[PDB]
Amino acid sequence: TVFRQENVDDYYDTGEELGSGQFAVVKKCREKSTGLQYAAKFIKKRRTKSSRRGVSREDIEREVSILKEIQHPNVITLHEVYENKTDVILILELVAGGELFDFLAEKSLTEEEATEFLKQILNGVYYLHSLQIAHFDLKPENIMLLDRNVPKPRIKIIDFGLAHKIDFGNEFKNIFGTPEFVAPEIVNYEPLGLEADMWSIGVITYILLSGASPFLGDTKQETLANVSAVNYEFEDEYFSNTSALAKDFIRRLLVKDPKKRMTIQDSLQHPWIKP
Numbered sequence: 001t002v003f004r005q006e007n008v009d010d011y012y013d014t015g016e017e018l019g020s021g022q023f024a025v026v027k028k029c030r031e032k033s034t035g036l037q038y039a040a041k042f043i044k045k046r047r048t049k050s051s052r053r054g055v056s057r058e059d060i061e062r063e064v065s066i067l068k069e070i071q072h073p074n075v076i077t078l079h080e081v082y083e084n085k086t087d088v089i090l091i092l093e094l095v096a097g098g099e100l101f102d103f104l105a106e107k108s109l110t111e112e113e114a115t116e117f118l119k120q121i122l123n124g125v126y127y128l129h130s131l132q133i134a135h136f137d138l139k140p141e142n143i144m145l146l147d148r149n150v151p152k153p154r155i156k157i158i159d160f161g162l163a164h165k166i167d168f169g170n171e172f173k174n175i176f177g178t179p180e181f182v183a184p185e186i187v188n189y190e191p192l193g194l195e196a197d198m199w200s201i202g203v204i205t206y207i208l209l210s211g212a213s214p215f216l217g218d219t220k221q222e223t224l225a226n227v228s229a230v231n232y233e234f235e236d237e238y239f240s241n242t243s244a245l246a247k248d249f250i251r252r253l254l255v256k257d258p259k260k261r262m263t264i265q266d267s268l269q270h271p272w273i274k275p
């Protein structure tokens with residue numbers, strides 16, 4: 001698929017940089033015709049087929065295709081796509097309250113505060129999984145707050161750069177995100193499905209409740225080895241006043257066998273979550 005090849009600067013003005021990663025930089029922008037504000041994500045293109053730098057067009061098109069499908073309060077939405085020789089530029093919904101990662105660095109949350117966030121994340125993921133979309137990169141850095149100066153911040157899931165349609169129940173691809181958050185099947189290069197996201201939610205929940213990462217080692221290989229072995233425990237110093245039901249919820253997500261792991265529907269019916 002080809003995208004708009006007019007200069008994006010003809011139609012938008014950019015402002016504050018929101019952040020950057022290995023292949024993308026995201027800048028606040030404003031559409032000239034409407035005054036409405038967006039986040040412009042500049043994704044660097046591959047400049048030869050055998051190169052390892054930039055993002056392959058296949059990978060860019062997959063992210064765009066997935067984003068075009070989604071419309072839900074807890075997920076980022078796509079406004080427009082432009083491209084030039086160097087970049088594909090996604091004009092995305094602006095979420096200006098910062099990363100859940102940074103919000104957490106300020107606070108450990110109460111179970112109420114944790115479940116307020118978690119319920120939104122679960123609602124977003126329920127929507128995605130209902131459409132057979134696995135996100136594959138869920139972590140606090142990819143959860144953005146709309147406004148962080150309110151008692152119960154609303155959130156949106158971002159960064160669909162690893163997301164895939166799972167129309168055959170699994171994908172077998174060497175899809176691989178951040179060691180602290182990837183499921184054992186990712187670590188072991190096994191077929192992957194919606195279940196991998198549920199593991200990541202378990203890790204996120206552990207972090208929300210304790211401020212500690214359950215599998216984090218001193219090096220990435222240690223973290224990955226810990227994940228594969230399900231080497232985590234609930235340290236009493238962090239979890240002494242955490243309910244047994246909260247621990248139960250986490251325990252049923254951090255399960256090595258994807259078939260035995262709670263699904264998104266299970267998570268919404270679990271007694272810690274269910275109203």
Ligand SMILES: O=c1c(O)c(-c2ccc(O)cc2)oc2cc(O)cc(O)c12
Nearest residue numbers: 018019020021024026039093094095159
């Ligand atoms: O740092 C990032 C960032 O801030 C955002 C973002 C912020 C607000 C939005 O409204 C939409 C996206 O996306 C990203 C996507 C990446 O692939 C890598 C990043 O580093 C960011």
Ligand SMILES: [Cl-]
Nearest residue numbers: 041158159160
């Ligand atoms: Cl994004």
